[PDB]
Amino acid sequence: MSALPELRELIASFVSEEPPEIRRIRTGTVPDLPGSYGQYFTAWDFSNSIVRDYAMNLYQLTRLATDESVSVENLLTVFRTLDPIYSTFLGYNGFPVLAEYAQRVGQPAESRAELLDRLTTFTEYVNRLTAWSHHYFPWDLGRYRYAAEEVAAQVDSLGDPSQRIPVRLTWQPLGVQVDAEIYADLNPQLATDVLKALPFTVLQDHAVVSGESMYAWAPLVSVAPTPVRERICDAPVGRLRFSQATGNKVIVQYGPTTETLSSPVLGKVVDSHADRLAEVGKAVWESTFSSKEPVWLTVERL
Amino acid sequence: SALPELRELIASFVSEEPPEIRRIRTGTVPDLPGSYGQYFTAWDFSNSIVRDYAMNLYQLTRLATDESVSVENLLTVFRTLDPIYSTFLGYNGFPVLAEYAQRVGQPAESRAELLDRLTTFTEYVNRLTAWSHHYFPWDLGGERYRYAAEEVAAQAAEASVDSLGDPSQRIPVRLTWQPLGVQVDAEIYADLNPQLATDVLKALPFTVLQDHAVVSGESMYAWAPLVSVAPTPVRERICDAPVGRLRFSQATGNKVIVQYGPTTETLSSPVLGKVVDSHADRLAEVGKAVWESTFSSKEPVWLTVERL
Ligand SMILES: O=C(O)CC[C@]1(C(=O)O)N[C@H](C(=O)O)Cc2c1[nH]c1ccccc21
Ligand SMILES: O=C(O)CC[C@]1(C(=O)O)N[C@H](C(=O)O)Cc2c1[nH]c1ccccc21
């Protein structure tokens, strides 16, 4: 079964609908009135920030539940030490249900597998809350721009053809359809958990720091190894990336990116459909920055 | 010390701005992080992640005090949590932080070796977190997003540790704010949270930068030069806290916190002491200048806490 069933009913609802907490924060209707001197953007910066970093903490704690080197109780000690300062603040800043369930994950787990299910459901709960928070934060406010002269100055063969799994990526209301190959031999365990989620329809958002890249919070939590990773900057156009640590997102790189980090490789959009990604990216950039007009991503198998 | 070079950098950065913070707020970070030629999105990530990496670093420092967890187990949780935090900060304006983050997790022989690394790194990140909080642009929301004044009055309308203990054990101190030129005297409650008060008093005297609370309300915190794993048996709800209250939040940056007005936060924080009632009326002026200092002015206000 599932250790926290009420979360699962919420997780499925939140891939479709805006979470109530994301609205009350973006509408400034949080009960305790967070935010100094009659404003709520300072509370908004924290509410968006913590929930992303809290989610990343939860995943690395969930990763250690797979580890038998660290005992079950010592892991609870590590959780009960790290969780309260994150959960108590977020409950004050329009995440009360999230605060309540963090205490249940800390409650003594008879089996390590139970604790793994508590962390797995909760990490998915926070990461969907994080997904909408990345969308509705007012990134358009940043007056602070690079000089035009500064911006102006700036694995597919490896593998087996039989393991290439055909998938389609469809973005609406734009209507752009592209097909892609999922490499199931490079990261076999990772791809198996992403394939199981297909078909999934999730919201599409743009990278605020990474460059010309888009991601979407897919409905899975993968503790699977990542043997084949690729530098984000070294990636080709049409690259399908899956970043488990940043929220189990499905990442598409439709242009040159600045970030130096190494991210796991899921697959690549066919080169003939690579030209279509550039039109979607601009719309996804505007939706995250300015419009807040939802662009939904549908990934399906062929 | 395990990292003596960093202790020179911690002492240097108390007075002066770190080089990493300046290049982020001026948009001179090397790889030009951001999307479509703007460095505010990277700024929002740099400031926030270093804040949450610092809080994670302290709880790892507090994890070393517990002997139920082995060092190999403790190193493993640092080897699992840190990489996603260290590597990005190295990309987003904190390259040296990633250098010492790798050195903290190297196989340690003793608990004191790991605790000294975590204690030094945490304070180094807590000063970097301090300067990122002062210069960050919080005025952007005041122009666009504001609570209504009438709904504020209603939220206050709908809403003793000072009595506890021996008044003889309290230790007087002095907080001096420059360039405002305002002095108040305060008593530190050594009975309630003794090990904490000892750990703070040993740092006296110190002169540090003073900033405001962006979310908590009418409160101002100053990053003091210590990392305290001391027990906190007496804590108080920040919304219930009185005016002139001195608090020390070991988890949110080891800061000296002065409440000079209404605060809405429900979290409980250890009680350091209280400004004497005769000198409480001087706090209203300082916080108004401290608000503008962090909210708008970005003009340094300094705090010198000394023993009397
Ligand atoms: O893989 C890529 O190119 C994107 C990498 C990334 C992601 O969420 O996956 N981008 C996000 C952004 O700045 O917009 C933030 C972010 C990413 N890793 C991170 C690792 C640590 C902290 C933050 C991030
Ligand atoms: O203790 C106080 O007076 C206020 C409490 C607090 C602090 O400890 O600094 N305020 C800061 C703010 O919101 O601006 C940030 C902050 C505090 N707790 C926190 C817990 C989790 C995350 C952030 C914070």
Q: Does B135 touch chain A (CB under 8 A)?
A: no
> Do the beta carbons of residue A238 and residue A254 sit within 8 Å?
yes
At A58, list the tokens: 């939860």
CATH of domain B165-307: 2.40.100.20
Up-side HSE of residue B169: CA atoms within 13 Å toward CB? 15
Q: Which residue has tokens 């709520």?
A: A40
User: Residue whose CA is closest, atom 5 of ligand 2?
Assistant: B216
Tokens of A62: 């969930």
Task: Write the residue with the smallest CA distance to atom 18 of ligand 1.
Answer: A246
Asked whether the beta carbons of A124 and A11 are under 8 A apart, the reply is yes
Helix (H) or strand (E) holding A226: none
Q: Residue B13 in contact with residue B123, Cβ under 8 Å? A: no
Give the mutation target among A243, A244, A258, A263 for probing the ligand 1 site: most ligand atoms within 8 A of CB.
A243
Query: Residue A119: which H helix or E strand, with range?
Result: helix A112-136
Question: For residue B242, what are the contacts with CB-CB under 8 A and spacing of at least 6?
Answer: B162, B259, B274
Show the tokens assigned to B134. 């002062």
Instruction: Residue A137: count other Cβ atoms within 10 Å of its Cβ.
Output: 25
Question: Distance between CA atoms of A53 and A47, rounded to whole angstroms?
Answer: 10
Q: Is the Cβ–Cβ distance between B258 and B283 less than 8 Å?
A: yes
The pair of three-digit structure tokens given for residue A163, joined into one six-digit string: 């393991």
CA distance A265 to A226: 8
B38 at A interface, C-beta within 8 A: yes
The yes/no answer on whether domain A159-301 falls in CATH 2.40.100.20 is yes
Give the burial string for B101-137 (b: 16+ CB within 10 Å, else e): beebbeebeebeebbbbbbbbbbbbbbbbbbbbbbbb
Spell out the residues 6+ positions from residue A236 whose beta carbon is closer than 8 angstroms to its own: A156, A253, A268
How were these coordinates obtained? Answer: X-ray
CA-nearest residue, atom 22 of ligand 1? B88
- Partners of B265 on chain A (C-beta within 8 Å) are 32, 34, 92
| Residue B211, CA distances (Å) to A81, A260, B223, B291, B292 in order | 27, 33, 9, 7, 9
Q: In this structure, which residue's CA is closest to atom 7 in ligand 1?
A: A246
Distances (CA, A) of B53 to A102, A210, B39, B84, B229: 19, 19, 20, 10, 17
- What residues form DSSP beta bridges with A196? none
Length of chain A in terms of residues written: 302
Distance of CA B93 to the CA centre of its chain: 20
Q: Do B63 and A81 touch (CB under 8 A)?
A: yes
Please check whether residue B104 is in contact with residue B118, taking contact to mean a CB–CB distance below 8 angstroms. Answer: yes
- B40 with A85: Cβ contact below 8 A: no
Q: Tell me chain A's radius of gyration from C-alpha atoms.
A: 20
The nearest CA of chain B is from the CA of A257 a distance in Å of 9
Q: What CA dihedral angle connects B294, B248, B131 and B186, to 10 degrees?
A: 60
What is the Å distance from ligand 2's center to B214 Cα? 9
First to last CA, chain A: 30
Neighbours of B45 (CB within 10 A): 23
| Ligand 1 centroid – CA B45 distance (Å) | 10
**Residues listed for chain B:** 308
* A202 residue type, one letter: V
d(CA B153, CA B147): 11
Q: Which residues pair with A295 in a beta bridge?
A: A204
The sign of the torsion formed by the CA atoms of B276, B261, B128, B21 equals negative
Question: For residues B180 and B286, is the Cβ–Cβ distance under 8 A?
Answer: yes
> What is the distance of C-alpha B125 from the center of its chain?
10
Rounded Cα distance between B272 and B170, Å, is 10
Task: Burial-class residue A266 by CB neighbours within 10 Å (0-12, 13-18, 19+).
Answer: buried
Closest CA to A129 of A81, A91, A78: A91
Cis peptide before B95 (omega within 30 of 0): no
Contacts of A288 (CB under 8 A, 6+ apart): A134, A135, A139, A205, A206, A208
Q: Which two tokens stand for residue A10?
A: 């919420």
How far does B56 lie from chain A, in Å, by closest CA? 7
Resolution (A): 3.3
Strand partners for A206? A214
Question: Which residue in B260, B268, B262, B279 sits closest to B193, CA to CA?
Answer: B268
Question: Three-state SS for A234?
Answer: helix
Q: Give the DSSP letter string of B183-203.
A: EEEEEE-TTTSHHHHHHHHHH
SS (H, E, C) chain A: CCCCHHHHHHHHHHHHCCCHHHHHHHCCCCCCCCCCCCCCHHHHHHHHHHHHHHHHHHHHHHHHHHCCCCCHHHHHHHHHHHHHHHHHHHHHCCCHHHHHHHHHHHCCCCCHHHHHHHHHHHHHHHHHHHHHHHHHCCHHHCCCECCHHHHHHCCCCCCCHHHEEEEEEEEECCCEEEEEEEECCCCHHHHHHHHHHCCEEEEEEECCCCEEEEEEECCCCCCCCCCCEEEHHHCCCCEEEEECCCCCEEEEEEEEECCCCEEEEEEEECHHHHHHHHHHHHHHHHHHHHHCCCEEEEEEEC
C-alpha to C-alpha distance for B174 and A184, rounded to whole angstroms: 66
DSSP assignment of A146-176:
--HHHHHH---SSS-GGGEEEEEEEEETTTE
What single DSSP character describes residue A201?
Answer: E
Q: Which residues on chain B are in Cβ contact (under 8 Å) with A86?
A: 52, 55
Tokens of A222: 């993968």
A6 Cβ contact list (under 8 Å, min separation 6) = none
Most A-contacting residue of B29, B31, B36 (CB-CB within 10 A), to test interface: B36
Residue whose entry in the numeric block shows the structure tokens 């951001």: B34
CA terminus-to-terminus distance, chain B: 31
- What are the residue ranges spanned by the domains of chain A? 5-138, 159-301
What is d(CA B11, CA B120) in angstroms, rounded to the nearest whole number?
11
Phi, psi of A222 (to 5 degrees): -110, 120
Task: Residue A201: name the closest of A170, A178, A225 by CA.
Answer: A170
- Rounded to whole angstroms, the Cα distance separating A244 from B96 reads 25
Chain-centroid distance of CA A4 in Å reads 21
Residues in the ligand 2 pocket, defined by CB under 6 Å? A 50, 85, 89; B 213-216, 219, 221, 238, 247, 249, 252, 255, 257, 265, 267, 269
Cα gap A123→A101, rounded to integer Å: 11
Q: Which of B138, B223, B248, B249 to mutate to test the pocket of ligand 2 (most atoms within 8 A of CB)?
A: B249
Nearest C-alpha neighbor of B81 from the set B59, B111, B66, B114: B59
CA distance A207 to A285: 8
**One-letter amino acid for residue B267 of the chain:** L
CA distance B92 to A211: 13
Q: Which two tokens stand for residue B53?
A: 């990496």
Instruction: Tell me which amino acid residue B48 is.
Output: S
- For chain A positions 8-37, those within 8 Å of chain B (CB to CB) are 28, 32-37
Rg (CA), chain B: 20
